[PDB]
Design a protein around this ligand. Sequence first.
Ligand SMILES: [Mg+2]
Ligand SMILES: [Mg+2]
Ligand SMILES: [Mg+2]
Ligand SMILES: [Mg+2]
Ligand SMILES: [Mg+2]
Ligand SMILES: [Mg+2]
Ligand SMILES: [Mg+2]
Ligand SMILES: [Mg+2]
Ligand SMILES: [Mg+2]
Ligand SMILES: [Mg+2]
Ligand SMILES: [Mg+2]
Ligand SMILES: [Zn+2]
Lengths: 308, 217, 152, 108, 115
Amino acid sequence: LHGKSGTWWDEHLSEENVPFIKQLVSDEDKAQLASKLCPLKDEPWPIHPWEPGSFRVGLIALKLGMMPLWTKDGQKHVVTLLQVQDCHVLKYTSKENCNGKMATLSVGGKTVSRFRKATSILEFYRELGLPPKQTVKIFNITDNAAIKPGTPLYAAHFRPGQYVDVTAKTIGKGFQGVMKRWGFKGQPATHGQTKTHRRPGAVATGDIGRVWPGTKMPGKMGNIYRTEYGLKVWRINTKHNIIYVNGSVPGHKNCLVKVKDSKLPAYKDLGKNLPFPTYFPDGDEEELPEDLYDENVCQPGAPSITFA
Amino acid sequence: RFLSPEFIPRRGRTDPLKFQIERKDMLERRKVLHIPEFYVGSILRVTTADPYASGKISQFLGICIQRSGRGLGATFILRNVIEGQGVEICFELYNPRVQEIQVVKLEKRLDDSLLYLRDALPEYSTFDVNMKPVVQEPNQKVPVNELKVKMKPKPWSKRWERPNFNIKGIRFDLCLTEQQMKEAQKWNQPWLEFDMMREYDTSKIEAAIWKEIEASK
Amino acid sequence: ISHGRVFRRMGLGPESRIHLLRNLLTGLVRHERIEAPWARVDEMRGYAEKLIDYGKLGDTNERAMRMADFWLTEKDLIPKLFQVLAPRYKDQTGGYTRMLQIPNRSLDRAKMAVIEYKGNCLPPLPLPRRDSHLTLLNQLLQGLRQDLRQSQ
Amino acid sequence: AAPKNRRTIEVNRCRRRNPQKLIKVKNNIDVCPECGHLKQKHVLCAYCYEKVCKETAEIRRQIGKQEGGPFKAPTIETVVLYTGETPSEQDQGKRIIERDRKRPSWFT
Amino acid sequence: AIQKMTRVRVVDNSALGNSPYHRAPRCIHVYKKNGVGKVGDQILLAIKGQKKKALIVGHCMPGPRMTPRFDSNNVVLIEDNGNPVGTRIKTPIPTSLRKREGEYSKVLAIAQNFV
RNA sequence: GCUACCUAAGAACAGCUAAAAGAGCACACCCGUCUAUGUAGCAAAAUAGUGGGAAGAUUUAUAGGUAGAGGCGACAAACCUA
RNA sequence: ACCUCGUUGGAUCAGGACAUCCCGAUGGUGCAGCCGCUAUUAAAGGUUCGUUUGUUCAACGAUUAAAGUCCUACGUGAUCUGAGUUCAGACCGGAGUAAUCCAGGUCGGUUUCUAUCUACUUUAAUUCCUCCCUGUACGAAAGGACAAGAGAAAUAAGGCCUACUUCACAAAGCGCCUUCCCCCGUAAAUGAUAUCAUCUCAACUUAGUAUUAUACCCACACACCCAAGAACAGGGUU
Ligand SMILES: [Mg+2]
Ligand SMILES: [Mg+2]
Ligand SMILES: [Mg+2]
Ligand SMILES: [Mg+2]
Ligand SMILES: [Mg+2]
Ligand SMILES: [Mg+2]
Ligand SMILES: [Mg+2]
Ligand SMILES: [Mg+2]
Ligand SMILES: [Mg+2]
Ligand SMILES: [Mg+2]
Ligand SMILES: [Mg+2]
Ligand SMILES: [Zn+2]
C-alpha cells in the first residue's frame, strides 16, 4: 500500500502468456548468440601479429569436474574440465582509464536470465546485443590484443602444452574455528583438559595489551578469490569447448572460473604459437580436430602403452 | 545386460556433460582394451606393462575384493597371498598400461565387498597363480558362491558383525558369542531400509548410458 | 558445513525424524489434508510422493507391501493406499501432493504449511490464480503474440 | 566477565535503535481480489483458509459419524454432497457424505 | 606408513631377523624428515636389544594405485654402509622399488619374488 | 525431627557360587574410587558413567536418651539443624 | 664480618632483537681442492622426535641444514593443564618436656567467571638429496670443486576430490594440485687533494638491485533453491 512492492516478471502474466514470454525471450537469446558467430565478417578490429611482451585476453569457463589422465611416461595426472559457455568480449577500455597502465577487456560468460538482472545491466547488454552473463571479469591486455566487444571466445583460444592461471572463488566453508581455518593444533583430548580442545591458545603477548592486526582467528573461511598458477593445459575438446587443466582449480563444480595465460616467468614468451588476438573458428584456416592433445598424453583409443 | 559399475554415476550436482565426456573416453578405451564383466568375488588375472622395466609385462592373479570409483578413474582391488604374504593391488581399469584383464573365474559372492577376507583365514584369499580359467555357458546367470568364510580371532580390521556392513559371507556363529551378536545389534538402524528418500533410482540413467554405449558400437 | 546435505535434522535424531515423518505421512494418507510446520511438511512431501509410487507398484508387490507396512502406522490405510490413492494417480507420473503456505501458527508463530493429496473430496484450497488474460499487460502481450505469429 | 562501566542511554539508543533492530516494513501485503481480505503474496488468505478449514471440519465430523470407529478407512472414494444434490454417474460406487447446508460458492 | 614404535616384520634371511626374542622388532627412527616411512624408506630398528638399520619393502597402508598393499609391514635389515644383512628375501618385493631414488639394486638382487 | 553414640521394640537383604562364612560374583539397598558434566547449578555438594560393600563390626523406619567447656567421637578437632 | 635460610613450568598461539644456530654474500687464513678456523654483512625463511626426572635444567638415544642466545610481567593460566610453597589427613627423619616447629623426604588433596569497553577475526616458498656439468677445475697422488641445469622428495602456504582412505548426493586426509625477485659485505675502472700511486665520507664509471614486479577484485539503485550462509549478505530461478 506504500508503493514499494517488489515485482517479478511472472507476477502479472497470465497462464497463456507465461510460456509465450519464456519461449519468446529464449528465442531472442539464442538468436542474439547466433548473430555473433561470425566475428570476422562483422568489421573485426585490426588483427595484429604476436610480439614479445604482448598479453592476450583470457576466457571465463565453467568448472565441470575432474577426471584422470595419463602421460606416456606412465604417470597419472588429475585434470579438471573447464567448459567455455557463451563467453564473449563485452567491453574494452584503454590504458588511461583502466585503473593502471594496460588496456583492459571485460569478458563475460554463462548467459543468465534477463528477468533477474538490474536495469542498468540489462541496458548494457541490450546496447551490446547479447544476453546477460553471470560473471564479468577484466583482463589486462596490450593494445595489440584488443578484440571488438561481442566477439565470442572458445576453448581453442588456448592450446595443449600451454600453461594457464585459473582464478575463482574458493569453496565457502562458513564461519570456521581456528583448527580448521588455520590448522592450529588445539589442545589434548584428555589428561584434565576441560572445555578447550579446539580453541586458540594465546592470541598475543601480554605486553602489547592488544591483538595485532591480521591475527589468525576464527571466522569466515573460503568464498574468496584464489588463483592457481602454472597449470598445464593437457587437452582441448573443441566440440564441447572443454579445457583440460592440470590439477585442481579453486571453487566448486559448475562455478565460473577466470582462465588466462600463465604469468609465471618461465612461461613469459610461450604465446608465439598461440592464437594471438584469439582463436577465430570463422577464420576456417584449418578446422581443428574434435580433440587437441598434448604430446605426452596417453590418448584413449591408442594401443596400450608399452614402456619398450 | 550387465552395465559395468563405473558407468552409473554417483548422484550429485555435477553436470551430465562431464559424464558424457568421461563415458566417451571410457568407451573409446574399451574399444582397445576388452574390459570383461566381473563382480566382487570373481578371480581375475591382470597383465600390465611395467614402466620400471623396459616394455615388460607383469601378471597378478587374485580375487576381486572391491569395485569402486566411477568414470575413467574406476578401480578394482583384488587380493591374493604369495608365499604366505597377503597382498592386494588396486588396479585402475582405464589405465593405459593394463594390457589385459582376464576373468579366470566369473562368480558373484554373497557380499558386494570382500574386505573382510583380510580378517578371514588365509585359505579364503589363497589362489593358485597359474590356475586355469574356468568356462561358463554363454546363456547362463552368473554363479553366486554362497561360501561363508571362517574368521580369525576377533580383533579385526573392521567390526564386520555390525549391521551397517551387512555382511552375509561370514560365519559369525563360529567366532562370536550370541551375547556379542546381540550387542552388535544395538547399531541396527531398522528405519534405514525404509526411508524412501535415500534410495537412488538409476533406471533412466542406465537406459541413457546403454543408448550411449550402443551408439558407440 | 552442510554442502549437499538434503535432509533436515528433526525430532530427536535420525530414527525420531523418520518416526515424525511417518506420523505426518500417516495423517496425510488418512485425512488427505494436513496442517503442519512448513519444514516438516516440506520434508514429508517427498515421502508422500514415494508412497504413492510404491502404491502404484501394486498390492501384490512384496517390497511395496513392506514399505507401506512400515510407513503407515494405522494398517487400515494400507488398503486405502493401494486401492484408492494409487488408482487415483495411475494416470499421473508425479506431483501427487499440493503444498501451500498457511498463516503462521498462533501458538509459536511457526511457519505453517498445508499439504494435501490432489483430487481429494475435501473443499478446494484457495489456490493462487494468475492474473486474468484480459488485463492490460496480458492483452498487450496477446497483441505481441498475434503479431509475431502473423509475421513469422 | 562483568561489565566495567554502566552503558549510557546514548550508547544504548544507538544500539537498540539501529535499523538492523528496527522492524522491517513488509511490502508483500495485498488484498485478496476474491474477498477483499489482506493476505501476503505467497501465503493463503487467512479468512478464506478459515472458511475452508471449518467446512473441512464439518465434512470430517460427518465422515467420522459414517465410519463409526477407529481403523475404518474405506477402501473406496468419497464424495461430499450438499442439500439438493444427487450422486452423479461418476459418483456411483463412492461413499456419500451428506451436508445439511447448501453448496458453498467456493466449493465446486 | 611406518613411524616410531611400529612393530615390523623382518622379511630377511638374517640371523637377527630370524632369531626369537621377547620384544618384536620395533621401529626406532624413520630416516625421513617427516617421521613417516613408506616403501623404500630407511628406518632404525631395535632388534634383540640392538640398533640396526633396515629398509621398508612393504606395509599395510595403501599407496598409489597399481602398487601392492601387504598384510604386514615388511622390512629388510641393511648395514650402515648399505649391504643387506641377510642374503635372501622370501616374501614378494614390490617392483616399484626399482625407480625410486635411492640404492635398491642390492635388495632387488637378494629378492626372490616380485609383486 | 540433621549428625555422633546409645536404649527399646521392629524391618530388609534377588539370583548364582558355595556351605552354617565379619565367604565369592552380583540385584535391591548402603557408600562415594576415578573421570567428565555442572559451578547463582536440577542441587548452598547434584548428574552420568565407573567403582567399593552388599547375612553383617550391614542397612534401615519408629519412639526415647546424652547439651556447650558440655555431649558424642572405630581421633578426622570429626559431628552436635547448611 | 657466629650458623642457617628467605610462586613455577608445560600445552596453544606466538610478537620482537641480533649479540647468527642453519640457509645467503664477502675478507683473511699457520686453508694447494676438500675442508676446517676467524672476521664483516645478512633477521626474508627455518630452527626435530624420544627415555629418566614435576624438573626450571641436566644427561642420554636417534636425527637434522640447524636443533641459536635472548626480550616479550611463565610472553601467553577471564585459553587449558601440572607442580610446588602448603592448604585442612597421615607417616619417616631432625629439634623440642610438651604443645608444636623444620622446602627435609613420601602418599592424598574442588577457586569460579554468562565478555560491558579497547584490540583483533582472509596482508612471488624454502630446504635437502640425487643426477648432469664433474673425476671436471684443483691437486704429484690421495682426495676432490665451483657457478649453471634437470629430477626427486619433504616441509610451509594456498587450493581441490579423479582415484585411495575416513566416507558417500557432501565433508575430509592419510590423497592429489600449484607456488614467481632481489637487497650491498665487498671486488674493480679512471683519477686528484698529494702531477707516482689511490675503488672515491673527491669529482666520476661498473658489479647495483625495491620506485616489490605483478597477479586478484571492479555492473549504483515476493517467494523458492543453492556448491552462499549463524543473522544479514551473496548467487540462481529462461
Ligand atoms: Mg588433537
Ligand atoms: Mg572435554
Ligand atoms: Mg585398523
Ligand atoms: Mg531440534
Ligand atoms: Mg543373598
Ligand atoms: Mg561378604
Ligand atoms: Mg562411628
Ligand atoms: Mg590425628
Ligand atoms: Mg650482525
Ligand atoms: Mg597436617
Ligand atoms: Mg585417591
Ligand atoms: Zn480471501
